[PDB]
Design a protein around this nucleic acid. Structure first.
Ligand SMILES: [Zn+2]
Ligand SMILES: [Zn+2]
Lengths: 44, 36, 112, 91, 134, 97, 77, 176
RNA sequence: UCUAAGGGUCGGGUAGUGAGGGCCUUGGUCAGACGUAGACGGCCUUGGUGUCGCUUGCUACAAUUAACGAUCAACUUAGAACUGGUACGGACAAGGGGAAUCUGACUGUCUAAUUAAAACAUAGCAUUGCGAUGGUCAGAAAGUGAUGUUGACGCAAUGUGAUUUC
RNA sequence: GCUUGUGACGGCCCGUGAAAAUCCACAGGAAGGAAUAGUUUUCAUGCCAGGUCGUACUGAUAACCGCAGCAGGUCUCCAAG
RNA sequence: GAUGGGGAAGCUCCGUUUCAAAGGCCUGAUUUUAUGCAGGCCACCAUCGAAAGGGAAUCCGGUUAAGAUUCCGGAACCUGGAUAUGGAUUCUUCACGGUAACGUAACUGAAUGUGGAGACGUCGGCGCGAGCCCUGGGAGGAGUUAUCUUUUCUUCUUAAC
């Protein structure tokens, strides 16, 4: 495998990555809410 | 150094394996016995 | 500015009589007695806090399930896996030394 | 540079106990609070826990030694003479 | 160069730490799924209990049960030994594509189980079927 | 001298410094000789000897600790085990030392 | 007190043998600084735990109220 | 726990028994540190702990060999007849079966002067300087008691003397 | 009344290709139970808030001026004018200082209610004894108890009491 | 910022700073356990039960001790601008 | 501080594990002697002594002339016991996944050995959390208003689990 070659993500880029992950997980939870909502008609 | 020498006597000894005579046989794994 | 009291009858700042101050749904401050903090279990060989094991007071371990108290490995809840790796290697090399040494002893007593 | 001209580590004792007593305490104190090398892992990570007990920060080995220094000259010579005469027992 | 098919190693890390496995396929270069030098190996999860002269027929049959396992293992997590074990009886079943299917793992484990039971009953490789005490 | 032949190997041939690299070399069958510090823990010594026996590799115990072996190889850090992959110039492989 | 999410689990739990009483609670709340909307909490009283199901849709809450068992005794607010 | 050698038995009389050092610990009122050494009980399948006086160089995890035929290394205990001329021992048994009586304080030892033909006797120079003859079967630990140089540091303070002597039985402060 | 100084968080691009997430202004098909109304919602966009953009892959000075800008907040320091005083640490709070002699080294200590030291203790200093069939003691004597979980860098008794110099 | 709890560290010792009840885990493997049938109460749920004694009030220039309802003494917790 | 012992004219004394027959457990058709218990396993000595040490588990709201973590209402938890259903598991009988650190809803276990927790001095600064303190907007109530002050005071809370 290739060598490590150091390098680092700084602070701002890590902040942006964490923000994107939070936004994606928020949308995933909204989709989970939609899934819980939808099945009520089928079960009723 | 003396602590390492203290361990060497009890655990596996390359010098003793070399002294046993049969070397490639041991590398192929020719001698096997079960204790305990 | 609201001042509080101990709620049990021990009036002394002992190790087992520690309180916190909490606001209640009635909007008043009140003392809340806090139990002693739990200690992480330690490895049987090196003494380091073994990971994946819950941190509870000793009696509380009788309540949680097995998965909380062990990891999925030999000596799972007792040793820390680096000690387990060294134990495995030591046992294997002890067996190998026994084989080689027995062969040497037999050959030596043949040629002696 | 040097906050104290001569007194050194004995500066915590102020003007008390006498100059000669402070001087005598100084060398042993410097030995005691020093950080020593580890014979087992080769790192300068050994400090005294109690008089005679010396522990390495890395590799976590506890060894027995002198009261204020890891090794005494008497112990070093006893070690060497044991080595020599056991070698002559072998020979 | 000694990590090859047929070699017997000792697993030193993981859930199967302390067991003895035999290497069925060594990938020294690695792969996309496992970017490290690894090995497909087959081993024994539950060793057969050591029987004696007194034990009856049913007792021996139930004490000679073996639970095998199959796993991809990093080279750094193996303690290779000097012993050899014939892997040809399951070289075909133990392969890269097997581990991608839980059912194929099950069938390959059936093959390895019956092979190891036959070897143990025949009396071969008593060290490989012997349990390490550590 | 042993230090001189080690210096020749370090300045001419191929070497790896450290337990993980030397075990990788022994596993891949690239090593010829392994120099092991006298300070190395006995479990590691025995494991290295077992690997070298399996790989048909010579083992030499250096006289001195990690600091001495590192400064002999010519580095400013402590070195525990050195593996010789190529000794094209120096003759350390054949000498009794 | 435990919050339950699955409607199927909620219905099986409301059909459980130890369950006798449930409660329907109405809350007026806001959705993202939006209009005042209705929240219906169904709280089924078990032997050990009170199980709460939160529905934010009024029509679904009404249809679930219809779907409730007859023998279960429901307390409104 | 008292600092005593291992109880004499067949293993230590003829071969050797190997124990391992578990911890090196501080004993209140004693200058020398103590070593806890775990042995395997030859009869019963259980581990037995022993409290030796640590010699200089003894370390945790070290193998300590006890018996007639054990290596002449620091930490190992040996019958005085098994050691050669001029050796240095500690915690020397006065007579067989007492489990150690001489040179137990820190930085103190006993030198071997010479053996005896007529029976199993050996003569030794004690820390004070006396020359004594003990049974050659009496055991001793190879090396010098750890914690040497302790008396070289002045106490400088009545408070330090107070803390030292409250743990001992010596009356402090002294009267008369 | 001013002046100067001392910080935090966010900020990289369009020249350039094409897709991805969401109430998609308006416009298009399928399509939801209850009390003239009917949301939400299971599907899509080349658009919109040369075709702005919130996202990756990338060529192109990525910044050797981010040497700067947007935004947020605390109380400290230094200095300079002006200005009233019979006063400015305005009440409170708050060392008198120095020159020689005697004494004890010091920290410490006991006289509860007329006597707190020049006496007691103290680390240091020296001497003396003891290797277990022993030393020190308690005890009239003992199958004598302790020190003793003790071993000369230990135990104990003496006499002097820091240290240096003369 | 104050009070307090806590974490990772550093300093000090010729001073190195309780025990037991109790709970858990590991190693081991006497054994037991399934096919038109078993196991697992260290997963979830469901059922039953929890005795004896203290518990008011003060805690001090009015609740105790000094012959008092004494200008004295007597342990501790909370602590606004 | 008893017992076992030993002292003492004796009231009682010494000692706290010994110079004690100091008590539990497993198997059995022990194949013949015909209605009498056989074969084995393991070692240690009472008890008292802490309402500040160790230690199973409860909170909030309300209620009285005087009760309150104890009553009332709601919501929990601990311990012991009997047990059933679901889940899990099993024809590879006692689970799979992850290179690994390890994960999970489970995922049998007698003797015997071992490890962890209980379980631990003092001081210093540094970081973090909680309550309090200070403070902005807004929604209420009260005060001041001779003149001025988008003002001064106050409510805006959230337990165990
Ligand atoms: Zn460990
Ligand atoms: Zn070290």
């Amino acid at each position: 495998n290739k060598p490590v070659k150091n390098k680092k993500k700084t602070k701002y880029q890590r902040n942006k990555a964490k923000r994107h992950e939070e936004k994606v997980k928020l949308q995933q939870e909204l989709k989970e809410l939609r899934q819980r909502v939808k099945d009520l008609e089928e079960v009723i | 150094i003396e602590a390492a020498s203290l361990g060497k006597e009890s655990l596996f000894n390359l010098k003793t394996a070399e002294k046993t005579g049969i070397l490639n046989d041991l590398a192929k794994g020719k001698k096997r016995m079960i204790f305990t | 500015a609201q001042r509080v009291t101990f709620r049990r009858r021990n009036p002394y700042n002992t190790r087992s009589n520690k309180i916190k101050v909490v606001k209640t749904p009635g909007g008043i401050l009140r003392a809340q007695h806090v139990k002693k903090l739990a200690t992480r279990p330690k490895c049987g060989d090196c003494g380091s806090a073994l990971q994946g094991i819950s941190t509870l007071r000793p009696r509380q371990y009788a309540t949680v399930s097995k998965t909380h108290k062990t990891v999925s490995r030999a000596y799972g809840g007792s040793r820390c896996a680096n000690c387990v790796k060294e134990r495995i290697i030591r046992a294997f090399l002890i067996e190998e030394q026994k084989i080689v040494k027995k062969v040497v002893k037999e050959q030596t007593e043949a040629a002696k | 540079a040097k906050r104290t001209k001569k007194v050194g580590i004995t500066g915590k004792y102020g003007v008390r106990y006498g100059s000669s007593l402070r001087r005598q305490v100084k060398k042993l104190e410097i030995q005691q609070h020093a950080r020593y090398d580890c014979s087992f892992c080769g790192k300068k990570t050994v400090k005294r826990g109690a008089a005679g007990i010396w522990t390495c920060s890395c590799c976590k080995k506890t060894v027995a030694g002198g009261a204020y220094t890891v090794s005494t000259a008497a112990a070093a010579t006893v070690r060497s003479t044991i080595r020599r005469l056991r070698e002559m027992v072998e020979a | 160069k000694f990590l090859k098919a047929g070699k017997v190693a000792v697993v030193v890390r993981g859930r199967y730490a302390g067991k003895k496995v035999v290497i069925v396929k060594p990938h020294d270069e690695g792969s996309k799924s496992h970017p490290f030098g690894h090995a497909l190996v087959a081993g024994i999860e539950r060793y057969p209990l050591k029987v004696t002269k007194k034990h009856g027929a049913k007792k021996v049959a139930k004490r000679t049960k073996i639970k095998p396992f199959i796993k991809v293992v990093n080279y750094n997590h193996l303690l290779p030994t000097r012993y050899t074990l014939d892997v040809e009886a399951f070289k075909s079943v133990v392969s890269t594509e097997t581990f991608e299917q839980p059912s194929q793992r099950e069938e390959a484990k059936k093959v390895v189980k019956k092979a190891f039971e036959e070897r143990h009953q025949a009396g071969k490789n008593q060290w490989f079927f012997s349990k390490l005490r550590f | 001298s042993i230090n001189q032949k080690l210096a020749l190997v370090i300045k001419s041939g191929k070497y790896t410094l450290g337990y993980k690299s030397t075990v990788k070399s022994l596993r891949q069958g690239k090593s010829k000789l392994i120099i092991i510090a006298a300070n190395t823990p006995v479990l590691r010594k025995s494991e290295l000897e077992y690997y070298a026996m399996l790989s048909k590799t010579k083992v030499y115990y250096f006289q001195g600790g990690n600091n001495e072996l590192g400064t002999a190889v010519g580095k400013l850090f402590r070195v525990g085990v050195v593996s010789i992959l190529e000794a094209g110039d120096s003759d350390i492989l054949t000498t009794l030392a | 007190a435990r919050e339950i999410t699955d409607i199927k689990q909620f219905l099986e739990l409301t059909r459980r043998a130890d369950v006798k009483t449930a409660t329907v609670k109405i809350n007026k709340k806001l959705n993202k600084a939006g209009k005042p909307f209705r929240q219906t909490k169904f709280k089924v009283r078990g032997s050990s735990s009170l199980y709460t199901l939160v529905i934010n849709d009024a029509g679904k809450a009404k249809k679930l109220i219809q779907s409730l068992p007859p023998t279960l005794k429901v307390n409104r607010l | 726990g008292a600092a005593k050698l291992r109880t004499l038995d067949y293993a230590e009389r003829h071969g050797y028994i190997r124990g391992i050092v578990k911890q090196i610990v501080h004993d209140s009122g004693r200058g020398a540190p103590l070593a806890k050494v775990v042995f395997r009980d030859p009869y019963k399948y259980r581990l037995r702990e022993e409290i030796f006086i640590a010699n200089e160089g003894v370390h945790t995890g070290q193998f300590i060999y006890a018996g007639k035929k054990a290596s002449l290394n620091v930490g190992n205990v040996l019958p005085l007849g098994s050691v050669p001329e001029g050796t240095i021992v500690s915690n020397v048994e006065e007579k067989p079966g007492d489990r150690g009586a001489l040179a137990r304080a820190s930085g103190n030892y006993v030198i071997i002067i010479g053996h005896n033909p007529d029976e199993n006797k050996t003569r030794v120079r004690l820390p004070s300087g006396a020359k004594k003859v003990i049974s050659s079967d009496a055991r001793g630990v190879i090396g010098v008691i750890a914690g040497g140089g302790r008396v070289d540091k002045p106490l400088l303070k009545a408070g330090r003397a107070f803390h030292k002597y409250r743990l001992k039985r010596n009356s402090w402060p002294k009267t008369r």
